[PDB]
């Protein structure tokens, strides 16, 4: 197709959606700020106006056609331009020093290249949310409500845990009633934030917890996750490096780590221990299909949503855990040091490891969990070439690991090292791998004996619901949170599309082709721990095992009109319904105020609104101390009080 | 302008800002000069040594402080003014029979000996020569010269408070550490002394002053933190007292003053639960306010209030 | 000289200053505050702390020797350095949105890399102090008081407005009681500003009034100075293309300029007056030395310091005014247009051009002025690649310009082009220049008939002071307030520093290279304006002489 941009010849494509993608594969750039990740849409910044004949249009809304004149650039579009990203800057939070988006943030770049010195609109204050209770943090002043993170947790993760509410200038983007995050049914995932264009979702950094570590006398270890190494190369602006993790373990050692392992030694444990695990269930046909636990994120998401399942969830420990409670409770005893001096570093691409570090199940074992981004950030932090760091191997005994054990980093890889296990022990006799959809793979498996059962690999949270409702003829299900697996975790480098994820993937393949020993029990340094401190089941069970729990919101979330913070009280509650709105309890409730108003000087008396109580027909109710009355009234709530 | 740069700046009439020290002032000095710099007492001592022998002028003193030191004692004694004692004198000496004790009513609890960069001591180390070399291994030292005594009636929080306050007005504002690290350690502290501190405050403030003493251009600042750091090591239980309640001491309460705050106060009850005089009186729902006519000051109501709003 | 970092083998240079720039040169960075412009100086940030013979200390003030270990990074300085990083952030206005600073500052880096994504030290309340009386914006609740803005107006500059005052936490960098810029004897050079690391030192944004203009119903007028042209591609981040210009003409077209001339064209009239009026002081020896009056900076200057030179000062406005005043008083009636119809916009490299355009003696010639680094906003907003645009000529009958002309950009251009023009009409027998330091120029000029004299290229304020007193024998001064010339001006992109203007000077070098024309007398749509509007000796007065006045406090 053939079009005039200002004037002179273009051609652009032959079928194309809208002017601004087939400007852009030209390469003509028209100012946006849509199209800010892979799941974005158009229509809500309105910057990327043009002029075709004479009235001012939206160009990713228009539809281009043979010989089109179009003007990109016109005073009154310039001016409408600058007013829409000065109406955007605002009310924006434009602090962007402890910004986590400082950098690499569109608006930030906009409102240089546009020359945006002084706001000329009023800073207008909003309600805004300031949600930190867990290891993804939420500010919605530097929200600039694409909608990104909606998409995202909702068609691509399938959870739907933050969407759109209220409207106008009230408009945000939160969860629930404002519930913080820890408490709602978010897996922490952290893809929300990979897609941010923003600083409004981020990673909680923990940088400083480390240093004063470091600055004590505790005796620090760190270990470093598999897919860490094929994705922090990005943070530097570097091309692919093998041998990654052998100069982070020479930084690592520099600023004063006193011990550096590797995960993928976790890996190949807990994939040893779920090899046998599944064998045991195959021959016993019972507690099918069994589903991997080395994704904290689906695990969580599993006890939200399939408490049926919990029985099917693998009792193994997810490597991260397998491997630091091997040493708090092996390592520590071998070197002769209290559990309590050993400071533990866990160096993730996933902020779910972090809500992981912290369960009740896991408490002390890992002391802080650091993502890649915070790992580059105590490179950059002491400005040394990390392509010039000179490589070290990692510390024995927990350095070494199979080439099965580092492919746990993208999905797959906890499947693939379960197979090759089984094999080593009783071999295969054929694999055949089906692709019924982009990120789901089956695999059907014959062993050499006869026996033969069918294995699932899904990646990407939401494709879940769909296998699991329709297909009932697997025995093993891997389930990765994210797409491409660990590769794509929350914590990996920004931007975070599948591209890269692609390109970090084909990193970690590299890698693991260059190690020599390809199953766990060529894993000399594991056989050694099974027989020297893992040899029998008890001890076994109580490091490498862990029990999950069902999730279901607790919420009282009562009215409250004269509450008491703390301390014990009477907590009468009046209900507020339609039925007993119809006779009295409005005016019970009024007397009851008042009566704490000129008694109860103390907080012994805590007058709160409740919703129906299922019990209309009897009369307005009271609730006192949890306790059904009927019939209520002043006085007969007075009688009860004293 | 007592740091040696800044003094010889200052004399040539400009802004009394030191400077870092590789040519140090003996070599190039008032500019660029060869200058030679000492204390008042020094180039006192000069004549007194002259006239006297080595030997004659070392028969008082200690075999590696020599001589006599001459101290201005302030603070609550019977007799406070300039005196002159050999090297080696403790402070009891100093403090009970040169200054002939305490007036009645006041006790010893601790004392400065060289101001803001000096060190603050207590019953433990009030016996010990004052010496060049057995201070520096004491966390102490002679200083200056100057003595002040500290009485029981007075709080170590706000001794550190006050010293924190004159370095922060008198840092030259060149480097970042103390120009911008006094003003911070300055803040906690007067957080401290209101009842607003937290634990986390008192970690902010223990590692704020390491890198103050460590990263300070000049002395000044190196020795800016160094009330804190003393005042820390012999009371950090005072600190705790001043964090989960009121001031031991009382210097603190005594002419302060608890209000509380209707901008965060929705009325709910506890405070009279503890106060034994019964200073609320409030309104349910609404802000409780304080009666202050019988508030004896115990700081039992900021000790419990879940929306910490007693001011 | 053999020195172990991180317990490795270095080997680094002999004779070292410090540590610090010693291991910058082998390689090994390490994280400071200090060095942020060619005016810094070491031990104020206290961030480049190393660990000798288990002692921390500064690199920057620590001198090499044999055999010493040193650990460059441990938790401790961890520790120390993210702690004097805090201390500074808590108290900087943290809004990079509108500064000036976004994007290039180092303070805005570190705080990205060192994960800084909270304060617990309180935001201290400061007091601040905003100007913005001057082109020249001063805010100092972005000022990290380096210094180094104070050492370029009195080392390099020689003016010295700028110093210290306060002390502790209250220590800004102002002027004597806080008296707003404007009204000081700054002479707006802008070099602080190019020299600031931060926002605190900023030139005032007048892209709004622009697209206002270009939004109404004026002929909007678009005018390029020779220097803009040389420095543009540094904001794009690209090769230099000798047409730029051309580039810049259709690009300010596309955005809806009726016209775009040449500045080269004014700077071609300006040296043709200069020089007849200083052949003519010459023949007869009145007002001598003669200073040219093409720096509005060195102008300020000269009416602040010099009283007694302004008769001496040329009477021939600089290329801007006189350009200005030639569009709107001769082409305007040329176009059957009113006066007020016209929107006539200066493209400067320079930030005293700003004042210059609403000084009292050219008010409402030129109607807003814009530095280079403001044409790069514009260009940047459209996302148009420049790089990409087809060039077309400047508008006529001001579009086309000599070699002379054209080198007004570098320091040494208005004498040049006033030799040229001379030696056009009186013939030059020989030049004998002479480089008495590094800024300063003599050189022994003898015509064909008559005497000798002497000019002087002096560029950089400051040097102006020591030459006049020492030297009495040189008939003409030629004064740039800025080094280099107007290819290191205040409104360059940034950062400029000495190697960036002579990468400058040698791309307008390269630029004047390829025009045919030499002089300014070959220039024929110059000559047609002298023998059409300007034939008689009145008009010539009031369209390109302007007057001085002195100015005290
Ligand atoms: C903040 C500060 C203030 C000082 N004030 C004085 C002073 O008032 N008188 C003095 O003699 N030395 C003072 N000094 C000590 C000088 O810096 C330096 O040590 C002096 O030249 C030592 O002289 P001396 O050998 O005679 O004792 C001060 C040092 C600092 C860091
Ligand atoms: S998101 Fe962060 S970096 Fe971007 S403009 Fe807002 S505060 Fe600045
Ligand atoms: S972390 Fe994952 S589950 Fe939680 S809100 Fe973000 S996208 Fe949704
Ligand atoms: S939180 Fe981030 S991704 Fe979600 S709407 Fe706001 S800016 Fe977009
Ligand atoms: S797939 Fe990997 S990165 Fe993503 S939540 Fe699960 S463990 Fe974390
Ligand atoms: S430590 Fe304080 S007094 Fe000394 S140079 Fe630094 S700011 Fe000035
Ligand atoms: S306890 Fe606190 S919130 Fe409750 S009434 Fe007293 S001051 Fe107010
Ligand atoms: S400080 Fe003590 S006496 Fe005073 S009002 Fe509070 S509880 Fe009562
Ligand atoms: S100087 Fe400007 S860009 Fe740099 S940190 Fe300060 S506000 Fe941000
Ligand atoms: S513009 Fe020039 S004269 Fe004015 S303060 Fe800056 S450096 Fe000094
Ligand atoms: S105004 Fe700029 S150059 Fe001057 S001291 Fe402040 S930061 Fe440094
Ligand atoms: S030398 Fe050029 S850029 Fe510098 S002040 Fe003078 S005219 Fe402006
Ligand atoms: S690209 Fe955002 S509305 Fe068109
Ligand atoms: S309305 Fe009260 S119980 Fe239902
Ligand atoms: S580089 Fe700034 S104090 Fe050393
Ligand atoms: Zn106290």
Redesign the interface.
Known sequence: MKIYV?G?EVIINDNERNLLEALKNV?????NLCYLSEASIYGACRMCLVEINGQITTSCTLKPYEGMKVK?????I??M??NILELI?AT?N???????R??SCK???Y??????????FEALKKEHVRDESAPVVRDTSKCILCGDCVRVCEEIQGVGVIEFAKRGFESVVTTAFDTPLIETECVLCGQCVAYCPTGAL?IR?D??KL??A??SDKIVIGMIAPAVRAAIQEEFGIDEDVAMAEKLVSFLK???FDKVFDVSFGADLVAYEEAHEFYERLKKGERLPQFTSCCPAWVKHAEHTYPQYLQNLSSVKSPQQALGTVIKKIYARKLGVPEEKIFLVSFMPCTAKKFEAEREEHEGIVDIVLTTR?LA??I??????IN?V?PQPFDRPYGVSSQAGLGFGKAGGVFSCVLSVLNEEIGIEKVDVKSPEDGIRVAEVTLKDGTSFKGAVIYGLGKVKKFLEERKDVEIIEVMACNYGCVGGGGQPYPNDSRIREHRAKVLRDTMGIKSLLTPVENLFLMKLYEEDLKDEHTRHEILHTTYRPRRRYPEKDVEI??????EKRTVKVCLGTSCYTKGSYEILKKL?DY??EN?????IEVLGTFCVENCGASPNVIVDDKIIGGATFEKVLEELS | CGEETALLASIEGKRGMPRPKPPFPAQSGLWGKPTLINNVETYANIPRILRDGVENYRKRGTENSPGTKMFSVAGPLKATGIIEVEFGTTLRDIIYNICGGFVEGEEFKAVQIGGPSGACLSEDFIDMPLDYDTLKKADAMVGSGGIVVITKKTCMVEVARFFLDFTKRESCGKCVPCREGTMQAYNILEKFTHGKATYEDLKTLEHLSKTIKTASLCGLGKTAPNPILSTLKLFREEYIAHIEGECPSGMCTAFKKYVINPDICKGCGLCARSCPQNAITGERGKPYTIDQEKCVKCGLCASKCPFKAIE
């Open positions: 200002d002179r390469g003509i750039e028209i100012p990109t650039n016109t005073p009154e310039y001016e331009r600058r800057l924006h434009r602090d962007c020093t402890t910004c986590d400082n950098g608006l930030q770049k409102a240089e290249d546009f020359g945006i010195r002084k706001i000329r981020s950094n940088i400083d240093i004063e470091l600055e520099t600023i004063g915070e950030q105590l950059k932090m002491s400005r040394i070439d010039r000179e004269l509450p008491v913070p703390n301390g105020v704490v108003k109860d000087m103390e907080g012994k």
